[PDB]
Design a protein around this ligand. Structure first.
Ligand SMILES: Nc1ncnc2c1ncn2[C@@H]1O[C@H](CO)[C@@H](O)[C@H]1O
Length: 263
C-alpha cells in the first residue's frame, strides 16, 4: 500500500530524492503486470533503479537471475533487508556508466526507470543489440513517443530510434498514485522486442536532420542540414511523396527508402 511504502521509508530514515527521480512502485498488481510482461526469464535480467527492492523481489521470486543497478547508496540497507536470502547482484553505480555493450546476448531489461535517464538509457541498450526484451515503466509522454504512429505530435526521432531496433508496445497506464511519492504525470508499461538491427548512423543522421527544423517541410529541414536540395527533391519525387511533405509523415521504411534514394 502507499501506507506500507511510506512506513518503510520512514523506518529506514529515507526520503524520496528528486535528484534521483525517486518514485517507488506501490502495488503488487503493478509488479505482477511488469513481471508477466517480461516473462519467461530466458536470459539474465538487469534492473535499473531497484529502489526499495519491490520489483527486484518479484523478479527473483519468478526465478530470474538479477543484476540490480542503483545510484543512491542510501538505499543499500533497505535493499539488503528486502532482498535478504535472495541471489541478487546489487551494483551501486550510475546506470548510464554501466558496461551495457558487454551484457550477454538474450539479456532482459526489466525496470521502473528513473525518468531523467530513461530515454538515453533505452536508446543505448537498443544500440547494443544484446537484449531479447526490454520491459519498463516510463512517463506516459515518453511511452507515447516510443509507440507513436506517423503524423502525430509524439512522433519523432525517439519513435524512429525504437522502431529501427524493435517492435514497441504500450501495455498499461499507471496513475501517479501507483507510486510513492506520486509523480506529477502518469506512467506507462512499455515492452520493446528487438528485431535484430544494430545502430545505423547514416539513417539517424537523416532522421535527426529531418526533425531538427520542425517548422520546415522535409525538403527544407534536410537542405538546411546540408543534404543537396536537388537530390532530396528527386528522392521524394521517386517515393511518390508531395514536394512539401513533412518529416512526421514518413514511417521507418519510408526513411530507409529515402536514405537509399539519397545515396
Ligand atoms: N542514473 C541512475 N542509475 C541507477 N539508478 C538510478 C539512477 N538515477 C536514479 N536511480 C534510481 O532509480 C530509481 C527510480 O525510481 C530510484 O531507486 C533511483 O534512486
Amino acid at each position: 500500500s502507499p501506507q506500507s511504502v511510506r512506513a518503510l521509508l520512514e523506518r529506514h530514515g529515507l526520503f524520496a530524492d528528486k535528484r534521483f527521480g525517486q518514485n517507488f512502485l506501490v502495488s503488487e498488481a503493478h509488479l505482477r503486470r511488469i513481471v508477466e510482461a517480461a516473462r519467461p526469464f530466458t536470459g539474465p535480467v538487469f534492473e535499473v533503479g531497484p529502489g526499495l527492492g519491490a520489483l527486484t523481489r518479484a523478479l527473483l521470486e519468478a526465478g530470474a537471475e538479477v543484476t540490480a543497478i542503483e545510484k543512491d547508496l542510501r538505499l543499500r540497507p533497505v535493499l539488503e533487508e528486502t532482498l535478504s536470502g535472495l541471489p541478487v547482484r546489487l551494483v551501486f553505480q550510475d546506470a548510464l556508466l554501466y558496461p551495457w555493450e558487454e551484457v550477454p546476448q538474450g539479456s532482459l531489461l526489466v525496470a521502473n526507470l528513473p525518468y531523467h535517464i530513461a530515454t538515453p538509457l533505452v536508446t543505448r541498450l537498443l544500440k547494443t543489440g544484446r537484449f531479447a526484451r526490454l520491459v519498463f515503466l516510463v512517463q506516459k509522454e515518453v511511452a507515447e513517443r516510443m509507440t507513436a504512429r506517423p503524423k502525430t505530435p509524439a512522433y519523432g526521432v525517439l519513435t524512429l530510434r525504437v522502431a529501427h531496433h524493435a517492435v514497441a508496445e504500450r501495455l498499461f497506464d499507471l496513475p501517479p498514485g501507483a507510486f510513492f511519492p506520486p509523480p506529477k504525470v502518469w506512467s506507462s508499461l512499455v515492452r520493446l522486442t528487438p528485431t535484430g538491427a544494430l545502430d545505423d548512423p547514416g539513417l539517424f543522421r537523416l532522421v535527426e536532420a529531418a526533425f531538427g527544423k520542425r517548422r520546415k517541410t522535409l525538403l527544407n529541414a534536410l537542405a538546411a542540414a546540408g543534404y543537396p536540395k536537388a537530390r532530396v527533391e528527386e528522392a521524394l519525387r521517386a517515393l511518390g511523396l508531395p514536394p512539401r511533405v513533412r518529416a512526421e509523415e514518413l514511417d521507418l521504411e519510408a526513411f530507409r527508402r529515402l536514405r537509399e534514394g539519397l545515396e
